[PDB]
Amino acid sequence: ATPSQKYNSRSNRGEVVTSFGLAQGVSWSGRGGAGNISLKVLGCPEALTGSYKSMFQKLPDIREVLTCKIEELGSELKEHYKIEAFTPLLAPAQEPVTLLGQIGCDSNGKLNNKSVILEGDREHSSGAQIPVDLSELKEYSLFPGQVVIMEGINTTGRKLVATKLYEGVPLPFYQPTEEDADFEQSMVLVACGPYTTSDSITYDPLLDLIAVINHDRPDVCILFGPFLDAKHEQVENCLLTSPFEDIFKQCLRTIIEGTRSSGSHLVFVPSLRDVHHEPVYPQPPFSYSDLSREDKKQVQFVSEPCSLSINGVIFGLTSTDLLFHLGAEEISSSSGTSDRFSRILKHILTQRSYYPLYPPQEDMAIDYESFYVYAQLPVTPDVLIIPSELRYFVKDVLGCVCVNPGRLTKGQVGGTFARLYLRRPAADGAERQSPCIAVQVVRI
Amino acid sequence: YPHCLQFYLQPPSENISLIEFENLAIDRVKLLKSVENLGVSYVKGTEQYQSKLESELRKLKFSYRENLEDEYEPRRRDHISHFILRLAYCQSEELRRWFIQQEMDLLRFRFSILPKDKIQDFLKDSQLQFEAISDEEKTLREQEIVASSPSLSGLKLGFESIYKIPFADALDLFRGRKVYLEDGFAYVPLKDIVAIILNEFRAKLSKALALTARSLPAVQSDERLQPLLNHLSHSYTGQDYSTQGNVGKISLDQIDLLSTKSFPPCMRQLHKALRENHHLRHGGRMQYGLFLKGIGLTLEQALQFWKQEFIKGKMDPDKFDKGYSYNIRHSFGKEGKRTDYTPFSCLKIILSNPPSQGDYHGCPFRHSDPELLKQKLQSYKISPGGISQILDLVKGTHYQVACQKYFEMIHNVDDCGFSLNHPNQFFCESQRIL
Amino acid sequence: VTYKGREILMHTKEMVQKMNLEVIYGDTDSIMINTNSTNLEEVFKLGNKVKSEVNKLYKLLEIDIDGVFKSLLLLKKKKYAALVVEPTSDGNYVTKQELKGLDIVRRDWCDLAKDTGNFVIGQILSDQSRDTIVENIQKRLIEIGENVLNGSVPVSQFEINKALTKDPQDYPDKKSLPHVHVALWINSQGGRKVKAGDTVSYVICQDGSNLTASQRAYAPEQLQKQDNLTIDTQYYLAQQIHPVVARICEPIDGIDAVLIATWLGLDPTQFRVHHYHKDEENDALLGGPAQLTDEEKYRDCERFKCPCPTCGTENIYDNVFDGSGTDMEPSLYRCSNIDCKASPLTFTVQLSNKLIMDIRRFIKKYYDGWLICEEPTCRNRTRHLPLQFSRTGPLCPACMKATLQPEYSDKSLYTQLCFYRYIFDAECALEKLTTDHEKDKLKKQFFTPKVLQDYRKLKNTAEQFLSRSGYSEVNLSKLFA
């Protein structure tokens, strides 16, 4: 009937929208569960193997987390750039003096090019704040809560004027081994919910996704949340006749049973929009009980943000729309000269965390102790997965290939999902050799 | 928890809900305060004292002889409660001494309850060795025990069990040559055994409290336990329960006779000062108004009462409205609670806002010197012996026990049957006596 | 050394308390003692006696008298207003007018507000008794409220001035700032523009557009030349005069911000609806409550709303039972709408689902981390926790001398969750009524096993959130470590 009528009458069915890497045949397929497939969570003290501890916050401890982050980034940047020595923010120095601190918006609104303050660290500036003037600065790209070293001149001690910004240095890549190069090419599927149109519960997009998974027989499939969106009008009005947990269990069991024949490994990444799960960031892995031996072997539940390795390739998984949040509150010298996505991804890779913006967007809850101990980048990931409301894309920045597949369903219109081959190349030769080979964002 | 008595020297490491934490702390504070008051009023050995403390322990479900319920709930409650109170009381030396005294009284009582047949295992379970001699050995050495025995009259060596203990553990006992020794082991009766047990327990408790006092700064950081543990004893009331919202039928005219028949001394003298002077300072006005609200005076009745008294003050009734009716209605009404919404308690009256010149509020026992206490008691027509014992209790800083004795005197009864902690409870019990 | 110092200081505090005095403040460098004495010589001899007894208790401690205050209003460390008693010859003394920490940081106050603040501070620093001071202040506040309400006050006194640090268009929060709104209006409609460093004058007005006050800020001459709109008296009473006076009067015992609102006008209802309930709480209470009761515990907690699926009528669930006396009926037995015959007990699922959403929202609201400055005059409302910190808490970036604290405290959220579980805790609610035969008849007539299971499920829907709830349980291992 009328519900989800567009999905039954969409012409773009199965038509690839974007390609990256090398030209590849339309008949994308893998070997399925056959062959040696490695799938291991990595780094960052195990990234919430268990559920959680608390929803109780302490201001001094949040302060400790923030200052520790600032000081760690500062030590790394100082040792890399061979900076002589930092100075207190409030010290009036006639000669240009390097200053360390995190950027912040003066008021509670969107950051403006002349409404920016620098907040220092305790061990150098005692956490003092000082306005910064960007009139003299030529090229810059800032957002709230990013750690920066600014070499401006401050002759009065009450207002700094910027003169140069130090591009932050990314983490070293993941050093492979002989076993990693011993892996043949494997195809990876990645899709992000919601899996039903804005006015439906039939979950037709999920059925189409299951069909394509079965047909292609990919090696590993990443499914981001939400699986029953909290913002869905059906649940926002609490018209459902079944508990949230029951509906989520039904959807998960349908997904699991649908892909039994494919033999493809399956991983579920939670999202903040999941109504039933805990609404806090970072999120622990989903909970499920009805698992057989084969199902338990084929399905893994991972936390979010998660940094898992498939066949020795570091994947950066984050379900929250980080790109949109950063773009909302990011300022830069030039807009059309460079791509916004490029510099936002640059910031994500540089800041060494899975959510560098601070304070986060209103529709987001971050537990800062668990975030500090579980949501830090271990190494510049080989591939970064950031499903975002922004348009789908596949960029290659600082070596890392960042893919935004896009939401699987926009309102009532069709969405897109990303396939990508992955093959660790020769152990030696070119200095940088991205394991990713080809990427195809394709319409569902 | 092998035994009911136990020595508290192994802190628990479980997890409990915050509500359980607060309930345990409050229950144990109530038990300790009851122990103190009951020991002060009565004698520590009379069957009345033991029975009353038994009833208190049963109602607070803190200890009992071994059974299914005792294994799980009362013993763990006692353990965690004792350690929470350790956290609460290690702040000051006076608090430490008070806690030690009352814990010693409680331990002595519990020991007296404990049947003899089990004491042995308790001593074994206490982790220090005391050995009981055999009947044959007791018969053989009865003459020696009697000869070495203290001034205890006669040769009667009754059924009291005799134990074999190293002389080291009876230093203060055998140092006076008042006990028999054999191969370095001393033979002691039950009373001296319990004395030794309590002495060692006191030493252990003192050391533990000193350590907790040193360790406090680490644990005081928590914000959801500071307001509870800081004033657990100093300024926390043991379930006054005489809160705002009571019901009753009080006639405004009758107030006067009630004041001379069923009011505690604080409210009695505050009412007399009001009637005689037609005016009260801020503190006394608030205290008495809150008390009248507590006893059952409705808002219109209270407004009429205060207005009628203030017409005699020679000031404009419209001025009365605009000035004080707002305050009275706010007291009877909306937010600002815990200072205006709630009637005061004996503890708050004693410990807060000492009266000054021209101010008649406060507990008379705590805030007026003995000469004026005697004057007031004489004016209240109480027997001289009653006045003497009231003054004795006041000198012992047991003001509430003194008020309890005053209640018994004026009501011409022997035992009041409760433990006053709130003036409105005083009035309610008096009305119950009619 | 610090431990011994704290020990001796606490002992001195308790001892001087035993001396029938009361100590109001002290940190290892000073002790303010309230003497309850109006005789200077008596105070001096009492100070000498306490010094002598503490000295003979601690031989080498050399205490001394630093100063005497005839009357003092205490608000915080180095925050007070006092009449310093400078002793002159022949025992006479001069009441030098001193006060620290009363400085106001922002200059966006009406002339009338400044006058009211000056009057209040002068009255409090007068030598007359507490009752007379309170009576004078109340009379003046009532007179000012009536004068403003009836329009007798000159409009010129309602004018407000505020400087412009940046250009009007460069303020990120231009929506919420009245002065930048007026700057934009004058720049657009008028001629000469307003630049950084200039001062803009504005007066709030009532347009009837149900907008925020900041959006209604109008120029003074614009108001004088327009008649369709008038001055917003309610705004001026709520957050232009109440802040200044309550910053000083609130600490006084027996007077509360609610009482000031009642004196000033018809705010009380909408005020306590729009009132901050943070500084009111203070554990200083010397023996008041033990653990309160459910009535006063869950008073601030938001009640559980729910739409009836059949009719859509709103239902409020503020307790397990509803009615009075004989008709103690479960709130789920019948829909709040008399016309609707659908028992909510049928729609438990929806209920549970809604409950989830509600608690979910609250969690997010708690994690927004909105910090508010405590000084009523500033009341800066930010979300970026400042690294700069004070002894008690975060330092206000606007008030370099103040303390931020959460808008939605963690314990507020804990109380909300406990209220949610209590609303459906049928078993416990069955133990609060004394009349046993009433319990028997009521439970046999409604509390069948099915409804018990439904209520238990509703309990669990919030108990599963409470189990992982942030030190709602205390770990003894850490405590006794």
Ligand code: SF4
């Ligand atoms: S003990 Fe309580 S009731 Fe008795 S006089 Fe003192 S305050 Fe009043």
Ligand SMILES: [Zn+2]
């Ligand atoms: Zn209905």
Ligand SMILES: [Zn+2]
């Ligand atoms: Zn402030």
